[PDB]
Fold Spike glycoprotein.
Amino acid sequence: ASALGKLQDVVNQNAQALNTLVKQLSSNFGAISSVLNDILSRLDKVEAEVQIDRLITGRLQSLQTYVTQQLIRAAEIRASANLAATKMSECVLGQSKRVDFCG
Amino acid sequence: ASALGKLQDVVNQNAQALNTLVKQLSSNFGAISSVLNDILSRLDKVEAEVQIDRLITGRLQSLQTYVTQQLIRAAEIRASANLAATKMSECVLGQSKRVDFCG
Amino acid sequence: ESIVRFPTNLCPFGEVFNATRFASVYAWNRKRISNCVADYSVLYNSASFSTFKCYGVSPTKLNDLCFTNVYADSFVIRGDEVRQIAPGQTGKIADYNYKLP
Ligand SMILES: *[C@@H]1O[C@H](CO)[C@@H](O)[C@H](O)[C@H]1NC(C)=O
């Protein structure tokens, strides 16, 4: 089952960061609680404003972390995709003279 | 006019993020106003310090967003540039034996 | 060089702060101060008010800042009642007779 690790790693890392991205919802980020309503329930808004910032600032940052990862990770796949499209064109469709490009 | 989309997309996305980067100047980011002087002319400094943070923290972050985008986007162009320099060398200057590399 | 541009006349602050009678907090008469030039340094220098408070502006920077229309709310309340009305703070005065944004 380890031959497909390359694929298996891609699928995992995607599902990985999603889990991480989700678990970031449950973190306090310095706010009094991770449930967005509890801060609204317990506290009068004027103070709760500052609290929700630490959630937003935390979460909103936590997206840019996730987004930036995907961009970087996609740029790898984008490179790997061309490698395939190169092989598919040269190796499959033609015959390759490039030593050990096709294996 | 859609044949040049590849170029047209590059030029747009650059001018795109710049617009976005500019429009970030007009956002409150939790501060009382987006004009850096108003916080100074409508608030004794000792408190205005904390306000300008939310501008700076917001804006200073908003650069790293823009910068990181450019880095990532340039790394794509950097990959596309080599593809050209590869074609220019192999396809134009020589004759390519690579099937469907030159089209 | 600095070229500040202003549009003079005179703003009747003296009538507002030295009106023999002040309206009740629940019902008060808005007064429009406009088409005039207002100096806040003279009010600060006189220091007739027991305390000078600016939630919004800074009193020193009031002269530097420009406001097209000045509106004054005149009411009489106890000193403890003045403490109740503040931005971000719930007060008995805020709850019924008057509200501050
Ligand atoms: C109101 O009366 C006080 C005390 O006489 C005076 O200093 C002040 O200048 C008067 N009003 C204004 C703001 O002109």
In short: Residues C 13-14, 17-18, 43, 46, 48 surround 2-acetamido-2-deoxy-beta-D-glucopyranose (CB under 6 Å). The two ends of chain B are 21 Å apart (CA to CA). Residues 21 and 65 of chain B are 9 Å apart (CA to CA).
